[PDB]
């Protein structure tokens, strides 16, 4: 009720993020700075692929000469012009400070945390943002010189309560050449994990009795 972030869910759970690839269109590089497109506008694009069960989402790709790759078990994915969304329920094992990090992103990524900005507790497809400041993290790779790597890293930390579920939604864009999406989590003791296994979860359809916010 007054949690403003957390869901209470009593249902069979499944490991992993839901990953969805959207249709890149020419000129989307200019939209990586657009607060409408990066929050909900991309949901107007055709969904090309959808899978579930991703617990280790980070990747770094650059293979000139071969423009496609296998991403999360999806074959023939264009990694140079990529629109990628992750959605899942983050579950705290203990009460304490958990972190979510986006490191050296190329080209751009945005992170929404909590039921008011990521998605609705009982409907992962119910997504709407109220303002352009709803995000928890936003990063874009701007050439700060002669370097080939984004030197910026971002971390969102929040005190979470044990047993509760927190909606998490990311959107990642690669415009050209290198694709770097390094998305990690941090435990209250400071341990940084690249694999979200046992912390990121999915549910099927949820009734009013199994889901409360
Ligand atoms: Ca790039
Ligand atoms: Mg398991
Ligand atoms: Mg336990």
Author numbering: 41 to 253
What does the paper say about this structure?
In general, they harbor an N-terminal A domain that is followed by a region carrying a highly variable number of serine/threonine-rich tandem repeats (B region). The A domain that is crucial for adhesion comprises the binding site, which, in the case of PA14 domain-related adhesins, recognizes disaccharidic ends of glycans in a C-type lectin-like manner. Binding is achieved via a Ca2+-ion being complexed by a unique DcisD motif and further amino acid residues in two calcium binding loops (CBL1, CBL2). In this study, we mined the genomes of ascomycetous fungi for hitherto unknown PA14/Flo5-like adhesin domains and identified such domains in several putative GPI-CWP adhesins of methylotrophic yeasts from the Komagataella genus.
KpFlo2 bears likewise an A domain (Q33-V256) sharing a high pairwise sequence identity of 59% with KpFlo1A. Unlike KpFlo1 and KpFlo3, the stalk-like B-region of KpFlo2 is not made up of any agglutinin-like repeats. Whereas KpFlo2A lacked any specific glycan binding and represents currently an orphan lectin with unknown target, we found a high preference of KpFlo1A for terminal N-acetylglucosamine (GlcNAc) besides minor contributions from a few glycans bearing terminal galactosyl moieties. KpFlo2 represents currently an orphan lectin, as we found no target glycan when screening CFG glycan arrays, which are biased toward mammalian glycans by omitting microbial and plantal glycan structures. As a fungal PA14/Flo5-like adhesin both KpFlo A domains have a conserved β-sandwich, which consists of a six-stranded and a four-stranded β-sheet. L1 adopts a similar conformation as in the structures of the Lg-Flo1, ScFlo1, and ScFlo5 A domains, whereas L2 lacks the subdomain characteristic of S. cerevisiae Flos like ScFlo1 or ScFlo5. Both KpFlo A domains contain the shortest L2 loops of all A domains with known structures, leaving thus more space for the binding pocket. Structural differences between Cea1A and KpFlo2A are mainly found for the L1 and L3 loops (for nomenclature refer to) as well as for the neck regions. The dimeric arrangement of KpFlo2A as found in its crystals is unrelated to Cea1A. These dimers are physiologically irrelevant as formation of a continuous β-sheet structure in KpFlo2A crystals depends on an intervening N-terminal hexahistidine-affinity tag without affecting the putative glycan binding site. The observed pentagonal-bipyramidal and distorted hexagonal coordination geometries of the Ca2+ ions in the KpFlo1A and KpFlo2A complexes, respectively, exclude the binding of Mg2+ ions to the glycan binding site, although Mg2+ is present in 4:1 and 40:1 excess over Ca2+ in the crystallization conditions.
